[PDB]
């Protein structure tokens, strides 16, 4: 069967307003491998880099989408995932406490 993606959105270092950082969207556990993973800044797609397609011992795939960012108090960041298992896109919001 097809397996749905798990999604985590998080920064590489603890977020400090105005301090340069990295924003990660880690997407794992899905099958088939066709997937669309977008990091969004205020709803707008960021030109973020995507890792090479790999998979775990249960054959399910994982991917890391990531880009530089400088968090502040105004901008909202989220990860949007489209996959055959999802009837509408999955959106996970970034927050510095997770």
């Amino acid at each position: 069967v097809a397996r749905p993606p798990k999604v985590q959105v998080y920064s590489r270092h603890p977020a400090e307003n105005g301090k340069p950082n990295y924003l990660n969207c880690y997407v794992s556990g899905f099958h088939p491998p066709q997937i669309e993973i977008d990091l969004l800044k205020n709803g707008e797609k960021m030109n973020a880099e995507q890792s090479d397609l790999s998979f775990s011992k249960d054959w399910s795939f994982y991917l890391l989408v990531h880009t530089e960012f400088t968090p502040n108090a105004v901008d909202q960041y989220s990860c949007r995932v489209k996959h055959v298992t999802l009837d509408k896109p999955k959106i996970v919001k970034w927050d510095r406490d997770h």
Binding site: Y22, N24, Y26, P32, W59, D97
Partner: protein, 275 residues
Amino acid sequence: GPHSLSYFYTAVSRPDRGDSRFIAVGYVDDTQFVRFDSDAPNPRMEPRAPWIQQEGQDYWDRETRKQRDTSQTYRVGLKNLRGYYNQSEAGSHTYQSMYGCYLGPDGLLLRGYRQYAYDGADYIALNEDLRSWTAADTAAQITKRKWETANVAERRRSYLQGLCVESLREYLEMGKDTLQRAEPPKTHVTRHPSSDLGVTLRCWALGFYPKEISLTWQREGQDQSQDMELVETRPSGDGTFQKWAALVVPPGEEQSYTCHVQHEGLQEPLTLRWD
């Protein structure tokens, strides 16, 4: 534990374009170090870690030639598999293989493996003896008899005991400064609102390598693995890993709880608490 060299092959059919795509990645332990993508123009095996770049042109030429040949075999294989299952020509399907070797304490093969999947389900696998196959269904029995007829298992076994282990040992030395050095986590504890009767304590471990780690919360010496929320270990983006463990505690009782962190990068386990 034991070091390992592992390769992961993904082939996908694309009937709309009349072809297929083959992607391979290689890891030493938890560090990706090469990739190959049949969609790349003039596709080559490419470095994905700094230490592998010292390999000379003959290595990259050889690896490129093997991956190009393998890409073609998996392209035709996807066609065979569609026929085995009498699937429509319009659907996309996925053929995966993974194989690798673990290094024993004596420098010999500790465990070798080679497995295949079709559309995410186990298809055929080399048994632990590296001499025979287990096939999952009627289609895979066709493949099994072909590979038995051609003595395929002997070549897998020779690769796993030989070149896999020898190249792993070479990579471990080339990348000793990062592959054989444990990077301990940077740790801290945060506190967050939760609900009526409780605040969340979250214990963070950032920037560690390798992936294996133990994060536990302990209410007064006894482990609290009841509603400890523990996220999957996730990549930092720089080759290290991140994890956190959280639990809801009674307001005003934060200082009764301790987070214990064990990681091979630490001289001894850590004991953290809320500030």
